[PDB]
Each structure stands twice: as structure tokens, then as C-alpha cells.
Design a protein around this ligand. Structure first.
Ligand SMILES: *[C@@H]1O[C@H](CO)[C@@H](O[C@@H]2O[C@H](CO)[C@@H](O)[C@H](O)[C@H]2NC(C)=O)[C@H](O)[C@H]1NC(C)=O
Ligand SMILES: *[C@@H]1O[C@H](CO)[C@@H](O[C@@H]2O[C@H](CO)[C@@H](O)[C@H](O)[C@H]2NC(C)=O)[C@H](O)[C@H]1NC(C)=O
Ligand SMILES: *[C@@H]1O[C@H](CO)[C@@H](O[C@@H]2O[C@H](CO)[C@@H](O)[C@H](O)[C@H]2NC(C)=O)[C@H](O)[C@H]1NC(C)=O
Ligand SMILES: *[C@@H]1O[C@H](CO)[C@@H](O)[C@H](O)[C@H]1NC(C)=O
Ligand SMILES: *[C@@H]1O[C@H](CO)[C@@H](O)[C@H](O)[C@H]1NC(C)=O
Lengths: 48, 48
């Protein structure tokens, strides 16, 4: 149901964020890409 | 008197921040943990 990012050699799931992930280009080029939220940790701070 | 994070093979003390550190869980589980202020680099910008 949920999407997580984890270290490779031990299951420690954590929320997808702009800290855990890096961008590269538009979605069409990658074979097998999937859709999700990526949380932006600035936004609750910016909002308050 | 003061707590720093340094690279391992050459002494270069840096202030402890949420950039040069990462979280995992509450303070109870770790044997030999210590208490200090992690400087959050966004707080002077939230003050601005
Ligand atoms: C996939 O993992 C997530 C995170 O552990 C599960 O979502 C939690 O599920 C429990 C039980 O239903 C709830 O109490 C939590 O509030 C849920 N957390 C969130 C952030 O939604 C999810 O149930 C797991 N999915 C499956 C199919 O096992
Ligand atoms: C992932 O999400 C994107 C954006 O919602 C989906 O792309 C759109 O898909 C529809 C139906 O095929 C097209 O009409 C649109 O032109 C697409 N692009 C945009 C920008 O809306 C995509 O289909 C989703 N992929 C999966 C596997 O669910
Ligand atoms: C590290 O800091 C925490 C938080 O101030 C200390 O936790 C307190 O410990 C006393 C022990 O008698 C408890 O009565 C308090 O309820 C605790 N506070 C909280 C907010 O839980 C902890 O003792 C400190 N550890 C060391 C080794 O100094
Ligand atoms: C994975 O295999 C299924 C087999 O039905 C196929 O439909 C799907 O296109 C494959 N995945 C990718 C990324 O092509
Ligand atoms: C560190 O070592 C000393 C001597 O072995 C012991 O008395 C002390 O309880 C230890 N403290 C921690 C935090 O491990």
C-alpha cells in the first residue's frame, strides 16, 4: 500500500523525502517508474 | 566542555547540526548516548 525507501542490506523503511531522494529529469525516460508523494520537510516549517 | 562532530582520519571539529547527523528512534535504546543541543540550521531562517 505505502511506498518507502530503505537501506539495501537491512529493512529499515522510512518516508520518501527530498532529503532521502535526488531528482533527475521528467518521468517519461525511466522504464518501470511508479507514482507517489515525496514529502518536502520544509513545508510545515514554512507554513508555521 | 563542547560537543563536535569531526571526520575520523583528521581532527576538524564542526558544530553538531541536523545536516551532519541523522535520526533513529528515541534516546532509551542506545548504550552510552549523551545529551547536547543539535543546532537546527532552519531556526535562524524561521526567525527571519
Ligand atoms: C504498510 O506500512 C504502513 C506503515 O507501517 C502501514 O500503515 C500503518 O498501518 C497501521 C495499521 O493499519 C495504522 O495504525 C497506521 O496509522 C498506518 N500508518 C500510516 C502512516 O498510514 C500499512 O498498514 C502497511 N500496509 C500493509 C498492507 O501492511
Ligand atoms: C502516473 O501519474 C501521471 C500524472 O497523473 C499519469 O500521467 C498521465 O496519464 C494519463 C492517462 O494515461 C494521460 O492522459 C496524461 O497525458 C498523463 N500525463 C499527465 C501529465 O497527466 C500516469 O498515467 C501515472 N502512471 C501510472 C502507472 O499510474
Ligand atoms: C538527558 O536528558 C533527558 C531530558 O532532560 C533526561 O531525562 C530525564 O531524566 C530524569 C531522571 O530522574 C527523569 O526524572 C525525567 O522525567 C527525564 N526527563 C524527560 C523529559 O523524560 C536524562 O536524564 C538525561 N540523561 C543524562 C545521562 O544526563
Ligand atoms: C513486468 O512484467 C509484466 C508481465 O505481464 C509486464 O506487463 C510489465 O510490462 C513488466 N514491467 C515493465 C517495467 O515493463
Ligand atoms: C563506562 O565504563 C565505566 C568503567 O568500565 C563504567 O563504570 C561506566 O558505567 C560505563 N558507562 C557507560 C555509559 O558505558
Amino acid at each position: 500500500t505505502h511506498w518507502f525507501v530503505t537501506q539495501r542490506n537491512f529493512y529499515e523503511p522510512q518516508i520518501i523525502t527530498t532529503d532521502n531522494t535526488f531528482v533527475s529529469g521528467n518521468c517519461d525516460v525511466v522504464i518501470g517508474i511508479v507514482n507517489n508523494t515525496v514529502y518536502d520537510p520544509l513545508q510545515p516549517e514554512l507554513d508555521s
